């Protein structure tokens, strides 16, 4: 029906993209100090709109909670580590004869999730636990 379209970096060059549908193209004529600062409109001659800016990220980064509130190299570091984490890699693990297999006894779905994790099947095959954690100076160990 042509409601959506496939664009490559070459065609990307000729188009004007809105980030949010509403938040980027309704009307004009007080605010929340807590909410981040987004610019304005200025550019209005739009041809396309982003399906969702979180879609700029890949599998590893789509697992991070609030990466938009983190220093860029830490988001890169986490990406490397998540691939060193344990949990159910597959349901048929009990049925495969493979060199090295690490499976978590009681894997838990994270309390803090990303809308992208629904597709990444993370809550269905998790790689961690929701540990009760204190940020504290205890024995110094």
């Amino acid at each position: 029906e042509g409601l959506v379209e496939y664009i490559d970096a070459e065609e990307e060059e000729s188009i004007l993209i809105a980030m949010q549908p509403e938040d980027l193209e309704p009307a004009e004529a007080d605010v929340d100090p807590a909410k981040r600062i987004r610019v304005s409109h200025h550019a209005t001659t739009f041809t396309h709109c982003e399906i969702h800016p979180s879609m700029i990220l890949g599998v590893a980064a789509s697992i991070i909670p609030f990466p938009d509130h983190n220093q860029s190299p830490r988001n890169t570091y986490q990406s490397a580590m998540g691939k060193q984490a344990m949990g159910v890699f597959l349901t048929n693990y009990n049925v495969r004869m493979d060199t090295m297999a690490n499976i978590l006894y009681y894997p838990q779905k994270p309390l803090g999730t990303t809308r992208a994790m629904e597709y990444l099947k993370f809550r269905e095959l998790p790689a961690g636990q929701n540990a009760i954690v204190a940020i504290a100076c205890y024995s110094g160990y």
Partner: protein
């Protein structure tokens, strides 16, 4: 696994850098540290 199946390799002016054109195409975060930083990409 999902990540591995979405990996890129670049053999051989500034390929290690996150070019503007990568927007929405390749992941801005996920790249190996040191060795092949920015040469190994993820969709």
């Amino acid at each position: 696994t999902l990540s591995h199946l979405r990996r890129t390799n670049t053999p051989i002016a500034k390929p290690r850098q996150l070019h503007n054109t990568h927007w929405g195409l390749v992941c801005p975060a996920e790249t190996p540290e040191g060795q092949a930083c920015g040469l190994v990409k993820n969709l």
